[PDB]
Write a protein that binds this ligand. Sequence first.
Ligand SMILES: Nc1nc2c(ncn2[C@@H]2O[C@H](COP(=O)(O)OP(=O)(O)OP(=O)(O)O)[C@@H](O)[C@H]2O)c(=O)[nH]1
Ligand SMILES: Nc1ncnc2c1ncn2[C@@H]1O[C@H](CSCC[C@H](N)C(=O)O)[C@@H](O)[C@H]1O
Ligand SMILES: [Mg+2]
Length: 260
Amino acid sequence: RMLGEMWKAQLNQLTRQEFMEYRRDGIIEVDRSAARKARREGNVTGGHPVSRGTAKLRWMVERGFVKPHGKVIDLGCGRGGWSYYCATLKLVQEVKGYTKGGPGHEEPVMMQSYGWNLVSLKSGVDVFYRPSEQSDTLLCDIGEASPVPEIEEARTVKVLQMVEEWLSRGVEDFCVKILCPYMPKVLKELEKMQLRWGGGLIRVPLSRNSNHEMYWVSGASGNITNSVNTVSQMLINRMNRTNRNGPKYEEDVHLGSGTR
Ligand SMILES: Nc1nc2c(ncn2[C@@H]2O[C@H](COP(=O)(O)OP(=O)(O)OP(=O)(O)O)[C@@H](O)[C@H]2O)c(=O)[nH]1
Ligand SMILES: Nc1ncnc2c1ncn2[C@@H]1O[C@H](CSCC[C@H](N)C(=O)O)[C@@H](O)[C@H]1O
Ligand SMILES: [Mg+2]
């Protein structure tokens, strides 16, 4: 058994009060109070990201793990945090985002962040049955949590099988959420996809301790098993501390306004 399986089992055994004290202990968290207000007041020009996802992709882009450029396709775009962020980037020319929407799913939000006119978000799209398209940059942020690791395993494998089809359509840069990177079917599939397409797995420190999500990104490298175990050991070490401090707060991304 991978160390991550022990982590998931230990996580599920926490009391609710332990879980709540653990999930954000020592992580980085952007202050979203101003953005949440702007969403309630319909402020689309203040530069506030539509979701917490913008800060996560910004973290990866600023360290060179992915380099959005040209035509960007954003699979599972939700409200559009990754898509609007990419449209602010100089090398990016066009952004197409697809998301399922509907009951219990996030709907695309229309924003006027810098470059908004380059962004087309389409709701009502199940990407698992959508024909693939050409892109220069492929992003995918799909993976619904479950307390059952085999369910997270199956969901992650489906994303990987879907992104295999899209990666063969001319993709130069990519960033794909790996919801459950420690289970055997995911590790087997990731290793084959790393052999074919390269890249490596990274942990964004804005990810909460209540998940083991990692990102398979074209600008990273390194042994996948080692990368996963490193995360698992860090998450277990955090779980086994009693003196909790909550998150380290940082400033959210500013996306500006105006057309490009
Ligand atoms: N012990 C314990 N584990 C939980 C609890 N809620 C969720 N989990 C575990 O944590 C995983 C992530 O749950 P989430 O609800 O997505 O995590 P979260 O940090 O609470 O994030 P948000 O609910 O979106 O604010 C689940 O798949 C479970 O394995 C809980 O109340 N107690
Ligand atoms: N089968 C499917 N087809 C298209 N979108 C899906 C999907 N299953 C889940 N999703 C969507 O994928 C999204 C992942 S959340 C993505 C957050 C985004 N990166 C941001 O920054 O705002 C969810 O909104 C979910 O509704
Ligand atoms: Mg929760």
